[PDB]
Symmetry: D2
Subunit: 306 residues, 4 copies
């Protein structure tokens, strides 16, 4: 009568006991995949998750991945692009310690299972479920350092709200995800090297130079305003792009697109505009574009479709 | 008698400085306006020398005028605004203004923005509130104000503590003032400075490279601001480079790439152990501003922390 | 080579001269339908618009309706439910006077035409286009009394952003609209009478009583919190609902759903929960539900599908 | 020595009053707590007599304690908070708190909310800021605070001017204080009042019925608050009834159903002609609070407007 839901854990908090109400909604199995703080999240853990989900797809009805809040939005988007399973994959975390007063973890997990168990949640991409809300893996980001309500889809809004164990879904992401992407990670053991550099007044070119000297496959710029670059940084990246380094212009600004056709001649320089992808998200999609192409023009079209 | 307001321009026109005043003839309903082109750069190219130049000029010309408007690009306006909020000693209003659409475009926001900046600079009630940013009918404090959207004319917001007042029909209802110490309540005296201490910013994300932090350490930087994940957390490699650096006297401030909320003391990072400073609600580019100035007074991490708790 | 776009005007500001750049994107024809401040918007103007759009659908490629900001979100939702034309219908207005400095009207109109001319805008329901943003008629609302950026889809987010005359659409409303609704207004000359009453501390039952004595077809409650009712008001509405008055619980609270299964036994009283529809929006959908049914249970299902 | 804090409870439990304290045993790390159940209603049933009772009690018991916490339903908390912000004369912190999830539910917000309300009430720095609402780790002022979402634990926000401070690890960094006059700076003295003037609220929308406004006028209401469209505008029929009413001495305040921003003077409505008052940033339920109190001092629309410009 109830769904089989697999909980993949990536850090701390067993739990069918800790949240006995899960037993009313699904049959939960749990697997510890890794045990890290999500500030140490890395390419290895990403590759492992995509493979496990892709491998175990026919063994369960849905997945819930328990993950730290810090880089949750990076992992969600990585999984969003590399997961080929059609069944729900829901990521979830907690803003407050397990043992703290009014800990958010218990109900978050419950709502995460609810979402993973809902047949209406399939084919919507990888999801993040926090604070009573279903959020798509592409647009979701953490907006506050301490607030329980931190997770928001700050450009295009949530897909659905959860009340009394039910979801009214009113949206679904248009950008292609999961089984509509060509990214296939099944045989990779490492990802292309992509770095992020910050722009601000009197910015040093040294961070950008250090990535170029290291032979990085790509560099994402956390630009100022609509993806602009401090002069030093621009000169160094203009050079990296003609030398075999893919360059993506994003923005430190927390909402809105870094657009083509603004102050930067992207085609003269061989640069790609990230659109609404923030820098860490642009990194994800740049690493994956680089397993398929090094051509700035092709990379730009990937940035326009996923 | 209308107040004398000086516009200091730092770039192009938003409605060069002579052209912008003729573009907004309604300004003479509200002030006697005088412009000087101080520099003419896109704010993506803003730098320490423009900051020194501006502060020294406001401080030198304070008695010559009733108020200042600074026209400035949107990209780094929040940085300049805060630098000035900590270094100007003039206690007449200093108001920063820019525009999100070009002066020539339909529904160009610069004209009315400039008008509202002048209103604000002319209001006696604007004094002693620190350095201000006026955008989209709203008066914002130089410390909290940041750009929130790549394109929206309403992008400028004080995202943690809110605006100071709203402007309707040429009048301001002020309801808030910044409690953090500013202007003539800070110890920062830039009158004799020719340069500012070197402070770079490094970003944190999954699988972050330590190369950017190492590059700043090898260049002998006086300070590094971490744009951390979540509540100011750092990826392993970045943590290790910045712990070493702080041990050899680099000042290290933990801020956050997360766009609202404080990087707090007493969370996952043991700051006192490492010699690290928590930025509070200062975002990375803003923490840079304060750390640069802190480093003109002290290299001690505990004193730098107290500076991060008072300004 | 260019779309035919019809501008229907409902108030003040010809305009192909006033915004000469329209000529680059469409061939614009203009018709003054009525000339009111939108604070005086009414059932008559609504019926007229739906009929005109429905009648003139095959004569144009898209519609733009210039309307005041005050009740724009009411008209947009009414048209959203009653328009049977498959072609874009875009509503637009201005926060600042025509003759004021940095007037928003010119570029708003331009972006409204851009949206109406985009083939990607069809089949998305009736839209509102303000401040560089494409907003669905159901969720859109005015959030600030004076801000140019006032129009937001505060529950589910915008459908698309407009940069340099192009729209990246990433969302579309799931709730049924336009030709997927049974509301057909082609032969109606009046709508059912629906009133709105406000809740607050020590609230009078007199507003609610006055609607009941008048024989209103329906009453929408702008409830407190999650759609709750001050005791006086509750008693009067509990009575209206058993007497032939349909009762919809909405909320004065500007975001979120008024849910079923919270503090109010909806089925015991014969009440309907508005969900995310604010009171003025709930009124629109209640007036239209009442042209089809007076049954609280059927009305509730209409509130769950449109 | 820990401060003495009194909890006045107005309804059910959020973690009756004796049960809530045993539910949050950590409170005795931070205060010596005493509870009184003052009433026990859902706040959807809040009313004038509870407001009179609360204010008179805080004012009577001010010397008996170091601070007050009022547990209260979320629905009308923003109303109570403002009534009290205008009538309490005690200059120790008064802090309102509630919960969005039931005490029994998973991840119940009431426990930690109550804890944070006590922290706030015990902080010496909380005094002289007016009446406060503490929800979701945030200290909000009683004038601006409103509920923004039907269900979200983070619903409480000061939507125009922002919060006063944020609470982390039991400490508050205060950065703002309300400039509008409150508490012992208002003239409103409710010590001898047995009731409050009658003020109803009418809603505006397309094709709005005038019946609700007529019903209030026929009942002899002392005041009516319009929940206008846009910048406080009124539908024709509603305008006409309320113009007539103001002409016969009903006070009429224009507010707005729009959830942020001021209902301004000098927009489309000629207030001085009609004898109408602009609410400013007061939302309709909040404008009711101030108008009720204004009507204890004056029935003159110009004096009522000045009251709407100062409090
Ligand atoms: N820094 C922690 C925060 C959390 O547990 O959510 C982590 O990301 O693992
Ligand atoms: N990038 C430009 C944008 C503007 O004009 O505001 C600048 O910051 O100078
Ligand atoms: N009150 C005016 C505002 C505007 O022109 O947008 C109207 O709705 O017609
Ligand atoms: N309607 C309830 C909700 C709550 O417990 O806050 C009340 O206002 O009392």
């Amino acid at each position: 009568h109830l769904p089989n839901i697999t909980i993949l854990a990536t850090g701390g908090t067993n739990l069918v006991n800790a949240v006995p109400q899960l037993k009313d909604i699904a049959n939960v199995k749990g697997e510890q995949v890794v045990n890290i703080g999500s500030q140490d999240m890395n390419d290895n853990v990403w590759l492992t998750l995509a493979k496990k989900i892709n491998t175990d797809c026919d063994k369960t009805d849905g997945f819930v991945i328990t993950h730290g809040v810090d880089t949750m939005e990076e992992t969600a988007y990585f999984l969003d692009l590399t997961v080929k399973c059609d069944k729900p994959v829901v990521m979830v975390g907690a803003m407050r310690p397990s043992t703290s007063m009014s800990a958010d973890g218990p109900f978050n997990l419950y709502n995460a299972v609810v979402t993973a168990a809902d047949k209406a949640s399939a084919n919507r991409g990888v999801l993040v479920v926090m604070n009573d809300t279903v959020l798509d893996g592409r647009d979701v980001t953490t907006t506050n350092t301490t607030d329980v309500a931190t997770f928001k889809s700050v450009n295009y809004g949530p897909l659905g709200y959860i009340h009394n164990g039910k979801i009214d879904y009113q949206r679904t992401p248009a950008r292609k995800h999961t089984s509509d992407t060509p990214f296939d990670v099944s045989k990779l053991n490492e990802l292309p090297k992509v770095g992020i550099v910050y722009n601000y007044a009197n910015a040093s070119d040294l961070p950008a130079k250090a990535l170029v000297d290291a032979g990085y496959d790509g560099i994402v710029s956390a630009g100022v305003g609509n993806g602009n670059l401090y002069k030093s940084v621009f000169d160094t990246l203009a050079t990296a792009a003609k030398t075999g380094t893919a360059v993506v212009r994003s923005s430190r600004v927390p909402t809105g697109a870094t657009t083509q056709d603004a102050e930067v001649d992207d085609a003269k320089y061989g640069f790609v505009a990230s659109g609404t992808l923030n820098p860490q998200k642009a990194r994800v999609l740049l690493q994956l574009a680089l397993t398929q192409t090094k051509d700035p023009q092709q990379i730009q079209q990937i940035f326009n479709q996923y």
